[PDB]
Amino acid sequence: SNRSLIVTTILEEPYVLFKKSDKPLYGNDRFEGYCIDLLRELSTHLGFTYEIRLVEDGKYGAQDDVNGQWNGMVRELIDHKADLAVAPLAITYVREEVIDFSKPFMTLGISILYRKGTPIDSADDLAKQTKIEYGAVEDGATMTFFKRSKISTYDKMWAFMSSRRQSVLVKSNEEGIQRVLTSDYAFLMESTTIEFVTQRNCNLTQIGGLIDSKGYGVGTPMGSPYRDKITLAILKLQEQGKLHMMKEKWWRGGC
Amino acid sequence: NRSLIVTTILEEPYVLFKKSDKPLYGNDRFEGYCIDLLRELSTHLGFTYEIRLVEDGKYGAQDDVNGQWNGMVRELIDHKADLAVAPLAITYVREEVIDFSKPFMTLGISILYRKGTPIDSADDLAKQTKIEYGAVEDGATMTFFKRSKISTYDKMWAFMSSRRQSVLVKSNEEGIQRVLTSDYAFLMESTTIEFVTQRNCNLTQIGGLIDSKGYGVGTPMGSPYRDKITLAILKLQEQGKLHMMKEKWWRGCP
Ligand SMILES: N[C@@H](CCC(=O)O)C(=O)O
Ligand SMILES: N[C@@H](CCC(=O)O)C(=O)O
Ligand SMILES: [Cl-]
Ligand SMILES: [Cl-]
Ligand SMILES: [Cl-]
Ligand SMILES: [Cl-]
Ligand SMILES: [Cl-]
Ligand code: NA
Ligand code: NA
């Protein structure tokens, strides 16, 4: 029998979660969510077995500007510590330079999560002021977008986030949501995750539209033969609408 | 170094002939979103190119009897073009035989029709025959319907196939004209619908997106340009240059 593939992932509702149960669960049986359903479809169509492992450092992945090293799921793939990353992992220029991605299984963009009842309507409006703090997940794609942007509004926002980083950069989306709920703080968040959150907490809203456009893809080490195979499997699922059905299943609930 | 041969197809606002009273020659004949994209790719990757319209006028589909591809897809399979730079949908059946860059635009199939009617979805079309409907022959929309297992879309394919000589058309332009001049709904890509409805205030999109797909640059399978073009697209997207190009070419109605 062929070696089981090691699949790195990260906890992020409704993509990847621990199942609720009173008895202890083991192995792959611990996990559920959209990305777990996707993994299951990939494994049956491509004919592999797998072991799910949560990324050890708890990060998506960014490059350190001083020493040039990556972290997170991206680094696990670079180092061949995982065969695949099946997660809400954004396909980005800087990541595509060092790892391979399948074509996207979902498309999205950065937007803003905030409390209802405000005249703030856009990133421009946030950038012009400092009473309302704002931030993003540390060492993820949203942070990196702001750090690399040459657009004046976003450059200004990065200077603020960077100055205040110990307070405004958070370690998970969950922590960002709690900051929105417990302080005067707006969270720069991926739009598909905002959709999930605002359907379940009717005090919160999206502010403005999408700031960029990107996709989530399955990550592989650079050169992996699984990359193109997984692209084909994803495209075949899209011929029959099975990914939008999986999205409906995990985003169903609202406000 | 050798200029890459770029296959393309006329499709507003992606690729058009420039208007002028004097004759134009070579690459200078063309403009549009995809032409602006090609220029950016060529500067960033450092190649020169020659644009050639696909001779058969097709995007590309597989013949159900003899297994041959046509259109831009066939030009790439046969190594007659180095790149296809066009509103060319990335699809499973195409990806099996050619390579694509990652998407420069995302979209889905939807419906173009007149305003003011009770038709609100594909299901409403599928259950009747008074209002005819169709798609571009030998494109990705047609192929989606031909391959679909979903009952509504399978019923719609049976109708299109029965009525093909009348309801399958050779271009989006032809499909628009059928909507405007007969009781006909056109199954059309949503970014093209957005362009059309901004300029035909009696037309509208019906329902939402029927599927999810992207447009990518096509290459022959195994080409080294595929990954380089993906990186250049991704770099344009980290600065919002593609949405600005979209805005330039899409530019309304009361
Ligand atoms: N999905 C992101 C993390 C969340 C965010 O950056 O907003 C990533 O792939 O890095
Ligand atoms: N863009 C399509 C043609 C138009 C359509 O099929 O709606 C293709 O790549 O085949
Ligand atoms: Cl509000
Ligand atoms: Cl889908
Ligand atoms: Cl098949
Ligand atoms: Cl790819
Ligand atoms: Cl963009
Ligand atoms: Na790569
Ligand atoms: Na391919």
Coordinates of C-alpha atoms and ligand atoms in Angstrom, one line a residue:
Chain A
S1 CA 0.0 0.0 0.0
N2 CA 1.1 3.5 -0.9
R3 CA 2.3 5.9 1.8
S4 CA -0.5 8.1 3.2
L5 CA -0.2 11.7 2.3
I6 CA 0.4 14.1 5.1
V7 CA -2.1 17.0 4.8
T8 CA -1.5 20.2 6.8
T9 CA -4.4 22.3 7.7
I10 CA -5.6 24.9 10.3
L11 CA -8.7 25.3 12.4
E12 CA -11.0 27.9 10.8
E13 CA -14.8 27.6 10.9
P14 CA -16.5 26.4 8.6
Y15 CA -13.6 25.2 6.6
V16 CA -12.0 23.0 9.3
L17 CA -13.3 22.3 12.8
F18 CA -13.1 19.7 15.5
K19 CA -16.3 17.7 15.6
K20 CA -18.3 18.1 18.8
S21 CA -18.7 14.9 20.7
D22 CA -18.6 13.6 24.3
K23 CA -16.4 10.5 23.4
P24 CA -12.8 11.2 22.4
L25 CA -12.3 11.0 18.6
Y26 CA -9.1 9.8 16.9
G27 CA -7.1 10.5 13.8
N28 CA -8.9 11.9 10.8
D29 CA -12.2 11.3 12.5
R30 CA -11.7 14.3 14.7
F31 CA -12.3 16.8 11.9
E32 CA -15.1 18.1 9.8
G33 CA -15.9 21.1 7.5
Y34 CA -15.9 22.3 3.9
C35 CA -12.2 21.5 3.5
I36 CA -12.5 18.2 5.0
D37 CA -15.3 17.3 2.6
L38 CA -13.1 18.6 -0.2
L39 CA -10.1 16.4 1.0
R40 CA -12.4 13.4 1.1
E41 CA -13.5 14.0 -2.5
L42 CA -9.9 14.5 -3.7
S43 CA -8.7 11.3 -1.9
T44 CA -11.4 9.1 -3.5
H45 CA -11.1 10.6 -7.0
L46 CA -7.2 10.5 -7.1
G47 CA -6.8 7.3 -5.0
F48 CA -4.7 8.3 -2.0
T49 CA -5.0 7.9 1.7
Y50 CA -4.1 10.6 4.1
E51 CA -3.3 11.8 7.6
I52 CA -4.6 15.3 8.7
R53 CA -2.1 17.3 10.8
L54 CA -2.8 20.8 12.2
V55 CA 0.1 23.1 11.2
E56 CA 2.5 23.1 14.1
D57 CA 3.0 26.8 14.4
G58 CA -0.6 27.8 14.0
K59 CA 0.1 30.1 11.0
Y60 CA -1.0 30.4 7.3
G61 CA 2.4 31.7 6.2
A62 CA 4.5 34.7 5.5
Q63 CA 8.1 35.6 4.9
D64 CA 10.2 37.2 7.5
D65 CA 11.7 40.4 6.0
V66 CA 15.0 40.1 8.1
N67 CA 15.9 36.4 7.5
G68 CA 13.9 35.5 4.4
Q69 CA 12.3 32.4 6.0
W70 CA 8.7 31.4 5.6
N71 CA 6.4 30.1 8.4
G72 CA 3.1 28.4 8.6
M73 CA 1.6 25.9 6.2
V74 CA 3.7 27.5 3.4
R75 CA 6.9 26.5 5.2
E76 CA 5.7 23.0 6.0
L77 CA 5.2 22.5 2.2
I78 CA 8.6 24.1 1.4
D79 CA 10.3 21.7 3.8
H80 CA 8.3 18.6 2.6
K81 CA 6.8 18.2 6.1
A82 CA 3.4 17.9 4.4
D83 CA 2.4 16.6 1.0
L84 CA -0.6 18.9 0.7
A85 CA -2.2 21.9 2.4
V86 CA -6.0 21.6 2.3
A87 CA -7.3 24.7 4.0
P88 CA -8.6 28.3 3.2
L89 CA -5.1 29.0 1.9
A90 CA -5.0 32.0 -0.4
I91 CA -3.2 31.8 -3.7
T92 CA -0.9 34.8 -3.8
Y93 CA 2.1 35.9 -5.9
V94 CA 4.6 35.7 -3.1
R95 CA 3.4 32.2 -2.2
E96 CA 3.3 30.9 -5.8
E97 CA 7.0 31.8 -6.0
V98 CA 7.9 29.2 -3.4
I99 CA 5.1 26.6 -3.4
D100 CA 2.6 25.3 -6.0
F101 CA -1.1 25.7 -5.8
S102 CA -4.0 24.0 -7.6
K103 CA -6.5 26.3 -9.4
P104 CA -9.0 27.8 -7.0
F105 CA -11.8 26.0 -5.3
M106 CA -13.4 29.2 -4.0
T107 CA -13.0 32.9 -4.9
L108 CA -13.1 35.8 -2.5
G109 CA -11.5 39.1 -1.6
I110 CA -10.4 41.1 1.4
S111 CA -13.1 43.2 3.0
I112 CA -14.0 44.7 6.4
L113 CA -15.9 43.3 9.4
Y114 CA -17.3 45.8 11.8
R115 CA -20.3 46.5 14.1
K116 CA -23.6 47.8 12.5
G117 CA -24.6 51.4 12.8
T118 CA -21.7 53.5 11.5
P119 CA -20.9 56.1 8.9
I120 CA -17.7 54.2 8.0
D121 CA -18.2 53.0 4.4
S122 CA -14.8 52.0 3.1
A123 CA -11.2 51.3 3.7
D124 CA -10.6 55.0 2.8
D125 CA -12.8 56.1 5.7
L126 CA -10.8 53.8 8.1
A127 CA -7.5 54.9 6.9
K128 CA -8.2 58.6 7.4
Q129 CA -8.8 58.2 11.2
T130 CA -7.4 56.5 14.2
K131 CA -10.2 56.4 16.8
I132 CA -11.4 53.1 15.4
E133 CA -8.4 50.7 15.3
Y134 CA -8.1 48.0 12.6
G135 CA -6.0 45.0 11.9
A136 CA -5.7 41.5 10.4
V137 CA -4.4 38.0 11.1
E138 CA -0.7 38.0 11.7
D139 CA 1.3 36.2 9.0
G140 CA -1.6 35.7 6.6
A141 CA -2.4 36.8 3.2
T142 CA -4.4 39.9 4.3
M143 CA -1.5 41.2 6.3
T144 CA 0.8 40.6 3.4
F145 CA -1.4 42.4 1.0
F146 CA -1.3 45.5 3.1
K147 CA 2.5 45.2 3.8
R148 CA 3.2 45.0 0.0
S149 CA 0.6 47.5 -1.3
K150 CA 1.7 50.6 -3.1
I151 CA -1.9 52.0 -3.2
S152 CA -1.9 55.1 -1.0
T153 CA -4.9 54.1 1.2
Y154 CA -3.5 50.7 1.9
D155 CA 0.1 51.9 2.5
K156 CA -1.3 54.3 5.1
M157 CA -3.3 51.4 6.7
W158 CA -0.2 49.2 6.8
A159 CA 1.8 52.0 8.6
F160 CA -0.9 52.0 11.3
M161 CA -1.1 48.3 11.6
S162 CA 2.6 47.9 11.8
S163 CA 2.9 50.7 14.4
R164 CA 0.2 49.1 16.5
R165 CA 0.9 45.5 15.6
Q166 CA 1.1 44.0 19.1
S167 CA -2.5 45.1 19.7
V168 CA -4.1 45.0 16.2
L169 CA -2.6 41.9 14.5
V170 CA -4.3 38.8 15.9
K171 CA -3.5 35.2 15.7
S172 CA -6.8 33.9 14.2
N173 CA -10.0 35.1 12.7
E174 CA -11.7 34.0 15.9
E175 CA -9.6 36.5 17.8
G176 CA -10.3 39.3 15.3
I177 CA -14.1 38.7 15.7
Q178 CA -13.7 39.0 19.5
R179 CA -11.8 42.2 19.1
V180 CA -14.6 43.6 16.9
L181 CA -17.2 42.6 19.6
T182 CA -15.3 43.9 22.6
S183 CA -13.6 47.1 21.4
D184 CA -13.8 49.8 18.7
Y185 CA -12.1 47.8 16.1
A186 CA -12.7 46.9 12.5
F187 CA -11.2 43.6 11.1
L188 CA -9.8 43.2 7.7
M189 CA -11.2 39.7 6.9
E190 CA -11.7 37.5 3.8
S191 CA -15.2 37.9 2.3
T192 CA -16.3 34.3 2.5
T193 CA -15.5 34.3 6.1
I194 CA -17.3 37.5 6.7
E195 CA -20.4 36.0 5.0
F196 CA -20.3 33.1 7.5
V197 CA -19.8 35.4 10.6
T198 CA -22.4 38.0 9.7
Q199 CA -25.1 35.3 9.2
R200 CA -24.5 34.2 12.8
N201 CA -24.1 37.5 14.5
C202 CA -26.6 40.0 13.5
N203 CA -24.8 42.8 15.3
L204 CA -21.9 42.6 12.7
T205 CA -21.7 43.7 9.1
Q206 CA -19.4 43.9 6.1
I207 CA -18.2 47.5 5.4
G208 CA -17.6 48.4 1.8
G209 CA -16.9 45.9 -1.1
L210 CA -13.9 43.7 -1.9
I211 CA -10.5 45.3 -1.8
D212 CA -8.9 42.6 -3.9
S213 CA -9.7 39.4 -5.7
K214 CA -8.1 36.0 -5.0
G215 CA -8.8 32.3 -4.7
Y216 CA -8.2 29.5 -2.2
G217 CA -6.2 26.6 -3.7
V218 CA -4.7 23.4 -2.4
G219 CA -1.0 23.9 -1.7
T220 CA 1.7 21.5 -2.7
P221 CA 5.5 21.7 -2.6
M222 CA 7.0 23.2 -5.6
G223 CA 7.2 20.6 -8.4
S224 CA 4.6 18.2 -6.9
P225 CA 2.8 16.1 -9.4
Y226 CA -0.3 16.4 -7.3
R227 CA -0.8 20.0 -8.2
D228 CA -2.2 19.5 -11.7
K229 CA -4.1 16.4 -10.7
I230 CA -5.9 18.3 -8.0
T231 CA -6.6 21.1 -10.4
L232 CA -8.3 18.6 -12.7
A233 CA -10.3 17.1 -9.9
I234 CA -11.5 20.6 -8.7
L235 CA -12.5 21.6 -12.2
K236 CA -14.5 18.3 -12.5
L237 CA -16.2 19.0 -9.3
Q238 CA -17.1 22.5 -10.8
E239 CA -18.6 20.9 -13.9
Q240 CA -21.5 19.5 -11.7
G241 CA -21.8 22.2 -9.2
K242 CA -20.5 20.1 -6.3
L243 CA -18.3 22.8 -4.8
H244 CA -21.2 25.3 -4.6
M245 CA -23.3 22.4 -2.9
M246 CA -20.5 22.0 -0.4
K247 CA -20.4 25.7 0.3
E248 CA -24.2 25.6 0.8
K249 CA -23.9 22.8 3.3
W250 CA -21.3 24.6 5.4
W251 CA -22.6 28.2 5.1
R252 CA -26.3 27.2 5.5
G253 CA -28.2 28.6 8.5
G254 CA -29.6 33.7 9.3
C255 CA -30.1 37.4 10.0
Chain B
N1 CA 14.2 36.2 -29.6
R2 CA 11.3 34.7 -31.5
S3 CA 7.9 36.5 -31.3
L4 CA 5.2 34.3 -29.7
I5 CA 2.3 33.6 -31.8
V6 CA -0.9 34.6 -29.9
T7 CA -4.2 33.2 -31.0
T8 CA -7.3 35.2 -30.1
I9 CA -10.9 35.8 -31.2
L10 CA -13.1 39.0 -31.6
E11 CA -15.2 39.5 -28.6
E12 CA -16.2 43.0 -27.2
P13 CA -14.7 44.4 -24.9
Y14 CA -12.0 41.8 -24.7
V15 CA -10.6 41.9 -28.3
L16 CA -11.8 44.3 -31.0
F17 CA -10.6 45.9 -34.2
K18 CA -9.7 49.5 -33.6
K19 CA -11.8 52.0 -35.4
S20 CA -9.8 54.1 -37.9
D21 CA -10.3 55.6 -41.4
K22 CA -6.7 54.5 -42.4
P23 CA -5.9 50.8 -42.7
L24 CA -4.1 49.4 -39.7
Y25 CA -1.5 46.6 -39.8
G26 CA -0.3 43.8 -37.6
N27 CA -0.8 44.1 -33.9
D28 CA -1.8 47.7 -34.2
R29 CA -5.2 46.5 -35.5
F30 CA -6.4 45.3 -32.1
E31 CA -7.5 46.8 -28.8
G32 CA -9.4 45.7 -25.7
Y33 CA -9.0 44.2 -22.2
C34 CA -7.2 41.2 -23.4
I35 CA -4.9 43.2 -25.6
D36 CA -4.0 45.4 -22.6
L37 CA -3.4 42.2 -20.6
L38 CA -1.2 40.8 -23.4
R39 CA 0.8 44.0 -23.5
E40 CA 1.4 43.8 -19.7
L41 CA 2.5 40.2 -20.0
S42 CA 4.9 40.9 -22.8
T43 CA 6.6 43.8 -20.8
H44 CA 6.8 41.9 -17.6
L45 CA 8.0 38.6 -19.1
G46 CA 10.1 40.1 -21.9
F47 CA 8.7 38.7 -25.1
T48 CA 7.4 40.1 -28.4
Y49 CA 4.4 38.6 -30.1
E50 CA 2.2 38.4 -33.2
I51 CA -1.6 38.4 -32.8
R52 CA -3.6 36.1 -35.1
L53 CA -7.3 35.6 -35.1
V54 CA -8.2 31.9 -34.8
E55 CA -9.0 30.8 -38.3
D56 CA -12.1 28.8 -37.6
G57 CA -13.6 31.4 -35.5
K58 CA -14.2 29.0 -32.5
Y59 CA -13.3 28.9 -28.9
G60 CA -13.0 25.1 -28.9
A61 CA -14.9 21.9 -28.2
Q62 CA -14.4 18.2 -28.9
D63 CA -16.2 16.5 -31.8
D64 CA -18.5 13.9 -30.4
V65 CA -17.7 11.4 -33.2
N66 CA -14.1 11.9 -34.4
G67 CA -12.6 13.2 -31.1
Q68 CA -10.9 16.2 -32.8
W69 CA -10.8 19.6 -31.0
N70 CA -11.4 22.8 -32.9
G71 CA -10.9 26.6 -32.2
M72 CA -8.2 28.1 -30.1
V73 CA -7.8 25.0 -28.1
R74 CA -6.9 23.0 -31.3
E75 CA -4.4 25.7 -32.3
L76 CA -2.6 25.2 -29.0
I77 CA -2.7 21.3 -29.2
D78 CA -1.2 21.5 -32.6
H79 CA 1.5 24.0 -31.5
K80 CA 0.3 26.5 -34.0
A81 CA 0.1 29.1 -31.3
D82 CA 2.2 29.7 -28.3
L83 CA -0.5 31.5 -26.2
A84 CA -4.3 32.0 -26.5
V85 CA -5.1 35.4 -24.9
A86 CA -8.8 35.8 -25.1
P87 CA -11.9 35.3 -22.8
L88 CA -11.1 31.6 -22.8
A89 CA -12.7 29.6 -20.0
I90 CA -10.6 27.3 -18.0
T91 CA -12.6 24.0 -17.9
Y92 CA -12.0 20.4 -17.0
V93 CA -12.2 19.0 -20.5
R94 CA -9.8 21.7 -21.8
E95 CA -7.3 21.4 -19.0
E96 CA -7.0 17.7 -19.9
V97 CA -5.4 18.7 -23.3
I98 CA -4.0 22.2 -22.9
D99 CA -2.5 24.1 -20.0
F100 CA -4.0 27.3 -18.6
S101 CA -2.6 30.1 -16.3
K102 CA -4.5 30.8 -13.2
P103 CA -7.5 33.0 -13.8
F104 CA -7.3 36.7 -14.7
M105 CA -11.1 37.1 -14.3
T106 CA -13.8 35.0 -12.6
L107 CA -17.4 34.6 -13.9
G108 CA -20.2 32.1 -14.4
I109 CA -22.8 31.1 -16.9
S110 CA -26.0 33.1 -16.6
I111 CA -29.0 34.2 -18.8
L112 CA -29.5 37.3 -20.9
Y113 CA -33.1 38.2 -21.7
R114 CA -35.5 41.1 -22.0
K115 CA -36.8 42.9 -19.0
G116 CA -40.3 42.8 -17.5
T117 CA -41.1 39.1 -17.7
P118 CA -41.9 36.4 -15.1
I119 CA -38.8 34.3 -16.2
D120 CA -36.5 34.3 -13.1
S121 CA -34.2 31.2 -13.5
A122 CA -33.0 28.5 -15.8
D123 CA -35.7 26.2 -14.4
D124 CA -38.3 28.6 -15.8
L125 CA -36.8 28.3 -19.3
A126 CA -36.4 24.5 -19.1
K127 CA -40.1 23.8 -18.3
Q128 CA -41.3 25.6 -21.5
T129 CA -40.6 26.0 -25.3
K130 CA -42.3 29.2 -26.4
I131 CA -39.2 31.2 -25.3
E132 CA -36.3 29.6 -27.1
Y133 CA -32.8 29.6 -25.6
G134 CA -29.3 28.7 -26.7
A135 CA -25.6 29.4 -26.5
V136 CA -22.5 29.9 -28.6
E137 CA -21.7 26.8 -30.6
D138 CA -18.4 25.0 -29.7
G139 CA -17.8 27.1 -26.5
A140 CA -17.7 26.4 -22.8
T141 CA -21.3 27.2 -22.1
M142 CA -22.5 24.7 -24.7
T143 CA -20.1 22.1 -23.3
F144 CA -21.4 22.7 -19.8
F145 CA -24.9 21.9 -20.9
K146 CA -23.9 19.0 -23.0
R147 CA -22.0 17.4 -20.0
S148 CA -24.3 18.3 -17.2
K149 CA -26.0 15.6 -15.1
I150 CA -28.2 18.1 -13.4
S151 CA -31.8 17.5 -14.5
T152 CA -32.7 21.1 -15.4
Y153 CA -29.5 21.5 -17.5
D154 CA -29.9 18.1 -19.1
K155 CA -33.5 19.1 -20.2
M156 CA -32.1 22.4 -21.6
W157 CA -29.4 20.6 -23.5
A158 CA -31.9 18.2 -25.1
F159 CA -33.9 21.3 -26.3
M160 CA -30.8 23.1 -27.6
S161 CA -29.6 20.1 -29.4
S162 CA -33.0 19.4 -31.0
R163 CA -33.2 23.1 -32.1
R164 CA -29.4 23.6 -32.7
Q165 CA -29.6 25.0 -36.2
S166 CA -31.7 27.9 -34.9
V167 CA -30.6 28.3 -31.2
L168 CA -26.9 27.7 -31.2
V169 CA -25.1 30.7 -32.6
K170 CA -21.6 31.5 -33.8
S171 CA -20.8 34.4 -31.5
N172 CA -22.1 36.3 -28.5
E173 CA -22.9 39.2 -30.9
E174 CA -25.3 36.8 -32.8
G175 CA -26.8 35.7 -29.5
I176 CA -27.5 39.4 -28.5
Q177 CA -29.2 40.0 -31.8
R178 CA -31.4 37.0 -31.3
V179 CA -32.5 38.3 -27.8
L180 CA -33.2 41.7 -29.4
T181 CA -35.2 40.5 -32.4
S182 CA -37.0 37.4 -31.2
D183 CA -38.4 35.7 -28.1
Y184 CA -35.1 34.2 -27.1
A185 CA -33.0 34.0 -23.9
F186 CA -29.2 33.6 -24.3
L187 CA -27.0 31.5 -22.0
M188 CA -24.0 33.8 -21.7
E189 CA -21.0 34.4 -19.4
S190 CA -21.7 36.8 -16.7
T191 CA -19.0 39.3 -17.3
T192 CA -20.1 39.7 -20.9
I193 CA -23.7 40.1 -19.7
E194 CA -22.6 42.9 -17.4
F195 CA -21.1 44.7 -20.5
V196 CA -24.2 44.1 -22.6
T197 CA -26.8 45.2 -20.1
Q198 CA -24.9 48.5 -19.4
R199 CA -25.4 49.3 -23.1
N200 CA -28.8 47.7 -23.9
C201 CA -31.2 49.1 -21.2
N202 CA -34.0 46.8 -22.2
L203 CA -31.9 43.7 -21.4
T204 CA -31.1 42.1 -18.1
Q205 CA -29.5 39.1 -16.4
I206 CA -32.0 36.5 -15.3
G207 CA -31.2 34.8 -12.1
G208 CA -27.7 34.2 -10.7
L209 CA -24.7 32.3 -11.8
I210 CA -25.2 28.7 -12.9
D211 CA -21.6 27.7 -12.5
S212 CA -18.2 29.1 -11.3
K213 CA -15.2 29.5 -13.7
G214 CA -12.3 31.7 -14.7
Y215 CA -10.7 32.9 -17.8
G216 CA -7.0 32.0 -18.2
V217 CA -4.3 32.3 -20.8
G218 CA -4.1 29.1 -22.7
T219 CA -0.8 27.4 -23.6
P220 CA 0.2 24.0 -25.2
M221 CA 0.4 21.3 -22.5
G222 CA 3.8 21.5 -20.8
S223 CA 4.6 25.0 -21.9
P224 CA 7.0 26.9 -19.6
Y225 CA 5.0 30.0 -20.1
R226 CA 2.0 28.7 -18.2
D227 CA 3.6 29.2 -14.7
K228 CA 5.3 32.4 -15.6
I229 CA 2.0 33.9 -16.8
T230 CA 0.3 32.8 -13.6
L231 CA 2.9 34.6 -11.6
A232 CA 2.5 37.8 -13.7
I233 CA -1.3 37.7 -13.3
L234 CA -1.0 37.2 -9.6
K235 CA 1.4 40.2 -9.4
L236 CA -1.0 42.4 -11.3
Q237 CA -3.7 41.3 -8.8
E238 CA -1.6 42.3 -5.7
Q239 CA -1.9 45.9 -7.0
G240 CA -5.4 45.8 -8.3
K241 CA -4.3 46.4 -12.0
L242 CA -6.7 43.9 -13.4
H243 CA -9.7 45.5 -11.8
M244 CA -8.5 48.8 -13.1
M245 CA -8.3 47.2 -16.6
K246 CA -11.8 45.9 -16.2
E247 CA -13.1 49.3 -15.2
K248 CA -11.4 50.9 -18.3
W249 CA -13.2 48.5 -20.7
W250 CA -16.5 48.1 -18.9
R251 CA -17.0 51.8 -18.2
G252 CA -25.1 53.3 -17.9
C253 CA -28.9 52.9 -17.7
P254 CA -31.7 54.9 -16.0
Ligands
LIG1 N1 -6.7 32.7 4.4 C1 -5.6 33.6 4.8 C2 -5.6 33.9 6.3 C3 -6.6 34.9 6.7 C4 -6.4 36.3 6.3 O1 -5.2 36.6 5.9 O2 -7.3 37.1 6.2 C5 -4.3 33.0 4.3 O3 -4.3 32.1 3.4 O4 -3.2 33.5 4.7
LIG2 N1 -15.8 32.2 -23.3 C1 -16.4 30.9 -23.9 C2 -17.2 31.2 -25.1 C3 -18.5 31.8 -24.8 C4 -19.5 30.9 -24.1 O1 -19.3 29.7 -24.2 O2 -20.5 31.4 -23.5 C5 -15.3 29.9 -24.1 O3 -14.2 30.0 -23.6 O4 -15.6 28.8 -24.8
CL3 CL -25.1 48.7 9.3
CL4 CL -19.2 24.2 -8.2
CL5 CL -15.2 12.6 -19.1
CL6 CL -2.1 26.2 -12.3
CL7 CL -6.8 43.1 -9.6
NA8 NA 4.9 27.8 -7.5
NA9 NA -3.5 20.8 -18.9

